[PDB]
């Protein structure tokens with residue numbers, strides 16, 4: 001309508017609802033909009049002096065297991081502990097994170113792994129997104145888990161009034177979004193590197209190609225009137241609700257939408273607003289069940305394809321889509337591309353032999369847009385939260401499963417297929433070790449032979465490869481199967497013993 005007429009009409013529709021909210025209800029909605037942060041002063045006070053000194057000098061961005069949120073908080077914490085010091089110390093501890101980008105020491109690792117338990121904000125919307133609504137996932141303290149459930153049940157009950165049959169087709173709602181919240185990989189290159197006012201057309205095509213549906217597991221907070229973008233908001237969603245979509249009015253002309261929303265992507269276009277290019281995303285709300293049907297149909301389809309390609313029984317459940325968030329369709333469709341690259345770049349007998357071993361152990365290839373600590377193939381086997389990891393990908397020997405987190409980007413990885421191939425490197429290590437001694441099953445990278453190889457060559461490849469024997473093996477494996485011939489040649493030239501060792505293990509596997 002008129003922008004303000006639309007605002008006043010929606011506010012009127014929800015006025016009784018708004019006036020009727022209890023103090024409890026208003027408090028929940030406030031909490032949801034603005035999460036409570038952990039107390040930095042209290043965290044620091046709880047540390048021993050040695051722990052304080054340890055935290056002062058830790059290279060947080062060298063950790064391999066923290067979420068972005070955990071890292072950013074620890075950085076803010078670190079500023080405070082350092083502030084008693086002085087400028088040289090301050091300036092020094094603070095620019096040999098150049099080539100120094102060393103793996104953390106075991107002492108630094110163990111400290112940070114426990115400390116992360118104490119830095120979680122109480123954030124209902126983040127909890128729903130990280131878990132994809134699987135709020136019983138044992139990735140946070142049980143008592144906090146219970147509070148989240150109570151709050152979420154209560155918010156669900158608050159949001160009982162639908163937008164209705166009168167307004168739904170007379171209004172659009174809006175959401176600005178950082179592309180990095182859907183895909184950090186494409187986000188890195190979305191904007192033209194020489195001219196910030198422009199979108200890279202190739203990356204744009206990649207972004208929209210398989211973007212057909214979207215899920216909100218958390219509560220969307222949408223603008224009644226479109227807000228001009230902040231510098232990092234290059235996505236401008238324009239959303240049409242369904243008559244049955246439940247919502248509540250929020251001050252300053254917003255709506256909070258019910259959680260567990262499905263959205264069909266109707267159109268994706270580059271538009272200009274004030275001499276800058278943005279991506280318009282036109283989306284229509286549909287029942288979430290309609291979207292889940294599409295994901296389940298895709299899961300059946302991709303397994304039917306890959307079971308045949310790999311010579312597995314047709315009914316094998318190998319590939320799983322654990323998909324719950326706003327770039328949903330791309331998580332699904334990109335899995336086909338990732339597996340194609342895997343098959344293209346690795347010998348067929350190797351892929352078949354290793355995958356059969358995984359399947360023999362009820363293993364899965366899990367493609368997901370929820371955080372890895374909330375994937376059962378991890379948490380069923382890492383019962384300590386301090387040992388749970390978020391990362392671009394993981395290999396869990398106990399579940400013989402490869403996990404791949406779609407929305408994030410691995411630092412030294414160009415794409416999702418390189419991450420998957422890295423994890424498959426761990427699977428190779430596992431199966432090769434299993435063959436060595438089927439009775440006491442260990443990784444081949446734990447052999448004295450490879451330990452000696454790592455001690456000699458472990459710094460000769462990637463920075464991340466330095467971490468330990470297993471990561472070195474996986475990194476060497478990935479680089480040996482790169483689409484870039486120069487990278488394959490680098491392993492052969494700079495880590496020749498590792499190159500030989502891996503090829504020898506590949507033969508052992510294929511010949512078993």
Ligand SMILES: CO[C@H](C[C@H](CCCCNCc1ccc(F)cc1)C(=O)NO)c1ccc(F)cc1
Nearest residue numbers: 064389391392393394395396410411412413419
């Ligand atoms: C794809 O992601 C990796 C990093 C990622 C870091 C995870 C570290 C966890 N390792 C211990 C572990 C294992 C299984 C568990 F269940 C729990 C804990 C990884 O190495 N995956 O294999 C990556 C590799 C190369 C790169 F350049 C960037 C990231």
Ligand SMILES: [Zn+2]
Nearest residue numbers: 422426471474
């Ligand atoms: Zn790894």
